[PDB]
Design a protein around this ligand. Structure first.
Ligand code: HEC
Ligand code: HEC
Lengths: 126, 126
């Protein structure tokens, strides 16, 4: 859907920005600094699930750019593995949110966070 | 969810960028330059529906910035009316996509486009 590689870069950065907000906004709830409203968390995680599928299609062949390391393309099986793992952790977060349990949510939120750090260490320029 | 107004601005611009891609990518299908796959369009419109709810929460009190005109805040009833109209047009697009009819899709896609132009003329800096 991108007329130029620059557009793919803008798209994935924008998707990632939105994901960061939707993930990050739950941190005070997970730490107990803000109240836990099960229906609010369920809705937000549903948004996060939608968003979390979107960036990966914008790292297609020939969309080198931004802070993406070339390793994303020269090691494509491994990158696909990492995004698929991350999306699996999101499914677990969605399951915790649907169940309405704050202990399961905290655990699942940590797994998501570690999936994020893992990928960045490997595939994002510092 | 925004620590500063700048973050609200970044968020809404990113959401709007994603919406533009998800809307814009259907233009060749609506014009018949690309093939119509009903299930592909249904899925994309589902993404668009999710995205199209997201920017409005980031134009809250005290998030002046970017290319937003101050009129968004000094005429808040009217702006809310415009985003709610736009989201109603998206519901119509979703209905057309679920029905799998290319004539209904074209009509609905035009209504969305006009809702977009209307809002921009009033509320976005040129
Ligand atoms: C499987 C890979 C991977 C996962 C998982 C991943 N990221 Fe990243 N992220 C990247 C890469 C690669 C970039 C660089 C993209 C670019 O600049 O083109 C990036 C960039 C970003 C950026 C900067 C975008 C910008 O504004 O330019 C943010 C924000 C970010 N990620 C947040 C997150 C958060 C938060 C999560 C999970 C909740 C996450 N990422 C998960 C790979 C990942
Ligand atoms: C109800 C109001 C409204 C509607 C509807 C609306 N927009 Fe806009 N749009 C704005 C405003 C206001 C801005 C400026 C936001 C800012 O810079 O803070 C904007 C900005 C944008 C931007 C620039 C974002 C950037 O990168 O800085 C794009 C892209 C855009 N809109 C696309 C669209 C598309 C495509 C649609 C519908 C499919 C649409 N808009 C619907 C109000 C609207």
């Amino acid at each position: 859907q991108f007329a130029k590689p620059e557009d793919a870069v803008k798209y994935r950065q924008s998707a990632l920005t939105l994901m960061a907000s939707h993930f990050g906004r739950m941190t005070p709830v997970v730490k107990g600094q803000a109240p836990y409203d099960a229906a609010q968390i369920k809705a937000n995680v549903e948004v996060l699930k939608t968003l979390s599928a979107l960036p990966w299609a914008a790292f297609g062949p020939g969309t080198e750019g931004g802070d993406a390391r070339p390793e994303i393309w020269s090691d494509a099986a491994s990158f696909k593995q990492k995004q698929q793992a991350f999306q699996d952790n999101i499914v677990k977060l969605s399951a915790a949110a649907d169940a309405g349990d704050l202990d399961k949510l905290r655990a699942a939120f940590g797994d998501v966070g570690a999936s994020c750090k893992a990928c960045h260490d490997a595939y994002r320029k510092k």
